[PDB]
Design a protein around this nucleic acid. Structure first.
Ligand SMILES: [Mg+2]
Ligand SMILES: [Mg+2]
Ligand SMILES: [Mg+2]
Ligand SMILES: [Mg+2]
Ligand SMILES: [Mg+2]
Ligand SMILES: [Mg+2]
Ligand SMILES: [Mg+2]
Ligand SMILES: [Mg+2]
Ligand SMILES: [Mg+2]
Ligand SMILES: [Mg+2]
Ligand SMILES: [Mg+2]
Ligand SMILES: [Mg+2]
Ligand SMILES: [Mg+2]
Ligand SMILES: [Mg+2]
Ligand SMILES: [Mg+2]
Ligand SMILES: [Mg+2]
Ligand SMILES: [Mg+2]
Ligand SMILES: [Mg+2]
Ligand SMILES: [Mg+2]
Ligand SMILES: [Mg+2]
Ligand SMILES: [Mg+2]
Ligand SMILES: [Mg+2]
Ligand SMILES: [Mg+2]
Ligand SMILES: [Mg+2]
Ligand SMILES: [Mg+2]
Ligand SMILES: [Mg+2]
Ligand SMILES: [Mg+2]
Ligand SMILES: [Mg+2]
Ligand SMILES: [Mg+2]
Ligand SMILES: [Mg+2]
Ligand SMILES: [Mg+2]
Ligand SMILES: [Mg+2]
Ligand SMILES: [Mg+2]
Ligand SMILES: [Mg+2]
Ligand SMILES: [Mg+2]
Ligand SMILES: [Mg+2]
Ligand SMILES: [Mg+2]
Ligand SMILES: [Mg+2]
Ligand SMILES: [Mg+2]
Ligand SMILES: [Mg+2]
Ligand SMILES: [Mg+2]
Ligand SMILES: [Mg+2]
Ligand SMILES: [Mg+2]
Ligand SMILES: [Mg+2]
Ligand SMILES: [Mg+2]
Ligand SMILES: [Mg+2]
Ligand SMILES: [Mg+2]
Ligand SMILES: [Mg+2]
Ligand SMILES: [Mg+2]
Lengths: 259, 60, 143, 67, 178
RNA sequence: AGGAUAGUGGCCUACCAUGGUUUCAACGGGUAACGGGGAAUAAGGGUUCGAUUCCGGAGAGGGAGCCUGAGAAACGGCUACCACAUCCAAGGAAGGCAGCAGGCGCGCAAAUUACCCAAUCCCGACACGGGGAGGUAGUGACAAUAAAUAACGAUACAGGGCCCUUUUGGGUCUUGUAAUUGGAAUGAGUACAAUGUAAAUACCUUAACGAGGAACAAUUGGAGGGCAAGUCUGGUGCCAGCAGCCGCGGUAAUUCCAGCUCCAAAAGCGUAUAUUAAAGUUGUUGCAGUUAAAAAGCUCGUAGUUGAACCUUGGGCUUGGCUGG
């Protein structure tokens, strides 16, 4: 079509943004960045639709042009910057630190974290290979390139990023029993431990995950993010709900008792 | 089939119909009021002739 | 065995046989052959404008005896000539030669109605003014 | 009635982070006076036909019309 | 362009236009509830016709089915909430037994007349349309406003109405002011 | 094997084989054919539609060829030809609304040459500029929602309802009639004003004004049947006309033209065309083929469709989760 698209129709935007139909014709098209278009959250949506700090798109640009917003310890002024899973957003004017972790309803939760926890992040290792001059490197889920990794680190593992120097503190090998959050599919946001990894050469490997309520679901390996060395030991603070999916009848019962 | 004929008699009956003006009668009620009028007329003051019920009885 | 195949793998025979036999439905033939597009004087439209050629009058069919007062109209869109009935007592006097009339069908969907022979259309408007408005003296003909 | 309200820490802060039309409502600013959109667009397209300075363009156009 | 805005029809007409049994039943039913026209009767029948369709689908499912339990209880609860269904008939078999007069009982027009605030049902509609009746602290001028059970006790004259402690109306002010 | 491409590849070339598709419908023709998400109708099964708010594709009068660039065979870029077509001082020059608005033509068929970047977003060197993208208003009975056009009294007069009662005569409370009588209530409209908005309009609130024939006056179709509602009155007299169909009209026409009355739906109602259900009149569910339409004159026969029965059963032992009670 003669070139890249630059617009995003409101109806064609990712559904987890929870945008309303009648507010306009278009939706924010996320810029190119560390995270994929379909799996990101532009900062305009976060500052106006989620926190409701800004009343409109003019105000979110005013906020970011005064150098308030930092992503992963660096000031960002791109209103459509594609923030994604495990990214850290810092607003030192409000003294708030957020981490983008999926909640069990499939959306990006407003998950506040402590300043101590905001000093690092986790990244899923996509590939390990040798660069020029024979230097090995690791590519994380947010496009980071870390040189000289621990030689035991392989793909589908999770590394702990120092997030100020970009180095690896330590890692978690992908194996049975590791704590996992699902980052894709209809089981998105659920948290459990690996029960069984089912291999399919030439196809898609499937992972069996057990919920804290001993509910079992299956999802693709590309949607699996290792977040802990074992059950009940996540390396980052989980959002409210701890990633356990309840049925609608259970949710109705819980809501009745709460109110 | 054969098609032809004199056109001189077009509008014959309507032209020679004697013009009669409408008597300036009371307006009928509109909307909910008209439904109220019809309901009573058919279920409150019934005008049946011992099983012979007519909406528009001609004078006879 | 009811004279038609019943096997679970005989869907092609069933599909082709039904497809062949819907051609016996004349309603179906006209939709796919496009006969309204090709043969109908209106070309498939509901209405069509035209110019009045002459006032003539059509004798009714038996056992009725009357002069159905019609006009000869040449359609603007394709130049075809059709006969159109002029409804109501005396509305032929509202229609003159070389007037622009809006036509519509008689409602029998391509067949003649009643005792009127060979007429499938009726006059709706003349000179851009409704014939009913002229008949009830709601409007006057612009002339 | 229901509405929305903002309170700034100072008038200076308010004048910086406010839309122009609200300051005009409160009398804190003057409505900017500009030509209509038709005039601005027509003038922009008229200037598109001139390469270089306007002074050079009108002097050269003037030279052609020896009148 | 902008996303389309959804809309739908809220009634359906009978298949046979002329039927003395249905015409007499409708007029008898319109006269009892002071309805403006037959469309207000078609509207109740339309939404009741689709209530039955929803109930039939759940009734074909096995008992203790998750969808039947969740949506069936919610539909019953909603019907109990507006006072159409009695508290002792929450079985989804009495839902099929509902009748249009059950729905017309819960209209604002019916409740104003039945609470004694009006002389007749036709006085109720004009009182509603003329901004005299308030539910809670909110003026409601829609006769078809369906009264909830918890809103039933809060139907009274508007606080700014001549009949409910407000000032005298336009007509009285012109007479007593001369 | 090479060339070319960003790259695979008969994509192209050289040399060489004779292959490739097809009754499981190739190839060709038609399409009043852009595909899909979806729309109408729908017991089920279905039938019809999808130019059009989103996604993908294609095009910028018709072809073809290119420059720049990461990206275009781009057309609000160029080059050339064809068809249209503009100015000219006659030497020459300049074009592309299937962008917005608007005009002509075409037609049964579709709105303003309006305001603005305030919202939604996009572009740029960018906190600032630009955006007929977009938003706002205008026209707008395309469709959709809610919903006025009156309500209540008082008397009169009648009937029922009761009661004082045998009826009689009354007291008296529920309806119906009132050119038979009132005082209340309100928004349509208008309006200070505030709100609304970029600025307005409108909406929403709200002073003052704003309803008796409350002329602030509801219409569209019908009244033989189908199909609800006239054997009323006048006119015409196989004429005029009505009539989807059956039929009506020749001097009291239940059908025409009118008046009265009545019926149906109502801010909507009628007509034309298409389509769906009704249609078990396309039938897989689920039609018919002696005589209503319909078994090839008779056998053979390829593809197609369809094809007898049969191979670990029974028994025993423990065994969990649930469902009466
Ligand atoms: Mg990246
Ligand atoms: Mg990053
Ligand atoms: Mg058909
Ligand atoms: Mg006949
Ligand atoms: Mg005309
Ligand atoms: Mg310039
Ligand atoms: Mg310039
Ligand atoms: Mg009746
Ligand atoms: Mg090769
Ligand atoms: Mg190649
Ligand atoms: Mg086409
Ligand atoms: Mg199509
Ligand atoms: Mg069906
Ligand atoms: Mg479509
Ligand atoms: Mg389409
Ligand atoms: Mg077309
Ligand atoms: Mg459309
Ligand atoms: Mg498109
Ligand atoms: Mg193109
Ligand atoms: Mg064109
Ligand atoms: Mg373009
Ligand atoms: Mg081109
Ligand atoms: Mg153009
Ligand atoms: Mg245009
Ligand atoms: Mg139109
Ligand atoms: Mg126009
Ligand atoms: Mg608007
Ligand atoms: Mg009116
Ligand atoms: Mg007004
Ligand atoms: Mg006004
Ligand atoms: Mg203002
Ligand atoms: Mg009428
Ligand atoms: Mg008549
Ligand atoms: Mg009848
Ligand atoms: Mg019939
Ligand atoms: Mg006579
Ligand atoms: Mg007579
Ligand atoms: Mg007579
Ligand atoms: Mg009769
Ligand atoms: Mg008739
Ligand atoms: Mg009605
Ligand atoms: Mg059926
Ligand atoms: Mg047939
Ligand atoms: Mg048969
Ligand atoms: Mg048959
Ligand atoms: Mg025979
Ligand atoms: Mg034989
Ligand atoms: Mg043969
Ligand atoms: Mg077998």
């Amino acid at each position: 079509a003669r070139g890249p698209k630059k617009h995003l129709k409101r109806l064609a935007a990712p559904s987890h943004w929870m945008l309303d139909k009648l507010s306009g014709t278009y939706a924010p098209r996320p810029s190119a960045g560390p995270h994929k278009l379909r799996e990101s959250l532009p900062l305009v949506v976060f500052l106006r639709n989620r926190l409701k700090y800004a009343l409109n798109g003019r105000e979110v640009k005013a906020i970011m042009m005064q150098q308030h917003v930092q992503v992963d310890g660096k000031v960002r002024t791109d209103t459509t910057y594609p923030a994604g899973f495990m990214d850290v957003i810092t607003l030192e004017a409000t003294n708030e630190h957020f981490r983008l972790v999926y909640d069990v309803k499939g959306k990006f939760a407003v998950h506040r974290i402590s300043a101590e926890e905001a000093a690092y992040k986790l990244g899923k290792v996509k590939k390990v290979q040798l660069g020029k001059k024979g230097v090995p490197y690791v590519v994380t889920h947010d496009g980071r390139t870390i040189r000289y990794p621990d030689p035991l680190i392989r793909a589908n593992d999770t590394v702990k990023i120092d997030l100020a120097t970009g180095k690896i503190d330590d890692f978690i090998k992908f194996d049975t029993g590791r704590l996992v959050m699902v980052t894709g599919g209809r089981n998105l946001g659920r948290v459990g431990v690996i029960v069984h990894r089912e291999k399919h050469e030439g196809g898609f490997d499937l992972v069996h995950i057990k919920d804290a309520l001993e509910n079992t679901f299956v999802t693709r390996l590309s949607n699996v993010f290792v977040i802990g060395t074992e059950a009940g030991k996540p390396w980052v603070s989980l959002p409210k709900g701890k990633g356990i999916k309840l049925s609608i009848s259970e949710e109705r019962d819980r809501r009745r008792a709460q109110q | 089939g054969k098609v032809h004929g004199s056109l001189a008699r077009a509008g014959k009956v309507k032209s020679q119909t004697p013009k009669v003006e409408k008597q300036e009668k009371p307006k009928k009620p509109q909307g909910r009021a008209y439904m109220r009028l019809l309901y009573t007329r058919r279920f409150v003051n019934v005008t049946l002739t011992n099983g012979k019920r007519k909406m528009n009885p001609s004078p006879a | 065995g009811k004279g038609k195949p019943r096997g679970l793998n005989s869907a092609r025979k069933l599909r082709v046989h039904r497809r062949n036999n819907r051609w016996a439905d004349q309603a179906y033939k006209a939709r796919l052959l496009g006969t309204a597009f090709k043969s109908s004087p209106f070309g498939g439209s509901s209405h069509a404008k035209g110019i009045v050629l002459e006032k003539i009058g059509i004798e009714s069919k038996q056992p009725n005896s009357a002069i159905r007062k019609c006009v000869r109209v040449q359609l603007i869109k394709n130049g075809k000539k059709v006969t159109a009935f002029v409804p109501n007592d005396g509305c032929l006097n509202f229609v003159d030669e070389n007037d622009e009339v809006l036509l519509a069908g008689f409602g029998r969907r391509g067949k003649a109605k009643g005792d009127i022979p060979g007429v499938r259309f009726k006059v709706v408007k003349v000179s851009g003014v409704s014939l009913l408005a002229l008949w009830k003296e709601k409007k006057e003909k612009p002339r | 009635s229901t509405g929305f309200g903002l309170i700034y820490q100072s008038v200076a802060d308010a004048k910086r982070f406010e839309p122009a039309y609200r300051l005009v409502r409160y009398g804190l600013a003057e409505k900017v006076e500009k030509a209509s959109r038709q005039q601005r667009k027509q003038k922009k397209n008229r200037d598109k036909k001139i390469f270089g300075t306007q002074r050079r363009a009108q002097k050269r156009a003037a030279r052609r019309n020896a009148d | 362009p902008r996303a389309p805005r959804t809309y739908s029809k809220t009634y359906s007409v009978p298949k046979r236009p002329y039927e003395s049994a249905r015409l007499d039943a409708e007029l008898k039913l319109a006269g009892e509830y002071g309805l403006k026209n037959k469309r207000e009767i078609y509207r109740i029948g339309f939404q009741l016709s689709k209530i039955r369709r929803a109930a039939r689908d759940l009734l074909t499912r096995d008992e203790k089915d998750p969808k039947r339990l969740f949506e069936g209880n919610a539909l019953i609860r909603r019907l109990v909430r507006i006072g159409v269904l009695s508290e002792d008939k929450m079985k989804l078999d009495y839902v099929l037994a509902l009748k249009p007069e059950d729905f017309l009982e819960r209209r604002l027009q019916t409740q104003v007349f039945k609470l004694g605030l009006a002389r007749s049902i036709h006085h109720a509609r004009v009182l509603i349309t003329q901004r005299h009746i308030a539910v809670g602290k909110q003026i409601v001028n829609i006769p078809s406003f369906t009264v909830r059970l918890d809103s039933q006790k809060h139907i009274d004259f508007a606080h700014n109405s001549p009949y409910g402690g407000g000032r005298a109306g336009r007509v009285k002010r012109k007479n007593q002011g001369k």
